[PDB]
Symmetry: C2
Subunit: 212 residues, 2 copies
């Protein structure tokens, strides 16, 4: 599909290291394989929001800010604006706080020509308490709102199938990573297997060969 | 109660401005009235995490990082660690992602001798979709885990009495403001009516008068 983003090799690097030197080094090594890097609070709080501009200027990669935005609408607006001003191409937002909080993010994205990803579900043990039960409704809330980009877990492939069912084949979906993840998701997110590898470039290359 | 924090005059400043000069100026002006300042991502993402150390060194105020932490346990750990390293006395965490994500924050707080506040409920319109229905259970989850500090809304006083009922009289509870708020909460949080006032110092003093 043409109106959703193109992620090189369907593989997104989760750059979860907290040290700038380490983060830049690994990312540089895999740039021939990956053009989209997901950055979280661990790195930006440790090293500064300026690191986003650094990734983009050094490597020309797309940056997804995995900030799991989860505040009231006014605060969400401010967070999204500060994040997009720093250069992020996209931001990941929680749906649990409801439609107004999501729309606040969509508004700033509209103003600044950036993207919003709705996080529908998480896969860590405690997610079963509240998140899993809300996930389908959060996905539908996104769809009813024209959200185009989603994040789903890939510890349960069949959940991805339900999610893909709700958001349609048109929507852009990314999920952690693998063969059956990519049967549902447009791109897989990979972290440790790359950034902790003795040879990250080889690790990335290896994963892509599997993706065939 | 002695094992819960003392907030000067039961009044917490919500420092929601995004530029460092304005933020420091207002906070300085109210330091005679307020010793506890809540700061959020809008300010720290715009100006850097170093601003926390600045508030503390300049004014000797307690800093609560309103980061609404809402990630998986490992990432929550890293977020709390970076935040406490930067000097925050306390951090606010979402309960919706479940007990393991909260406990991760409690672990780092235990290691570093800092505090965790559990956010039980929000009051913005979209909260009715998912958060309000989960609020009592999130509060009970906090209690079952010995969380001692809580954040609750103050747009519905009766919700505060429900929350106070669940967490007990021993727990520390903070909520937006203030007269009816302080029947239930230990301290009220105030933002705009102080930081946008032509005379913040007078605004603060004015509010404290009404609290007697």
């Amino acid at each position: 599909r043409v109106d959703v983003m193109d992620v090189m090799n369907r593989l997104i690097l989760a750059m979860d290291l907290m040290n700038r030197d380490d983060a830049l080094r690994v990312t540089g090594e895999v740039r021939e394989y990956i053009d989209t890097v997901k950055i979280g609070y661990p790195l930006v709080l440790s090293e500064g929001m300026d690191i986003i501009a650094e990734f983009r200027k050094r490597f020309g990669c797309r940056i997804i800010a995995d900030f799991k935005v989860a505040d009231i609408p006014e605060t969400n607006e401010k967070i999204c604006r500060a994040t997009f001003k720093a250069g992020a191409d996209a931001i990941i937002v929680h749906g649990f706080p409801g439609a107004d909080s999501v729309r606040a993010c969509l508004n700033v994205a509209e103003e600044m020509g950036r993207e919003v990803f709705l996080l529908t579900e998480m896969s860590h043990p405690g997610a079963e308490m509240f998140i899993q039960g809300a996930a389908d409704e959060i996905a539908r809330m996104g769809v009813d709102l024209g959200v185009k980009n989603y994040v789903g877990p890939s510890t349960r492939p069949e959940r991805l199938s339900r999610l893909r069912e709700i958001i349609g084949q048109d929507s852009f979906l990314i999920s952690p990573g693998p063969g059956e993840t990519l049967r549902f998701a447009d791109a897989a997110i990979v972290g440790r297997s790359i950034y902790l590898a003795d040879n990250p470039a080889a690790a990335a290359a290896g994963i892509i060969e599997s993706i065939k």
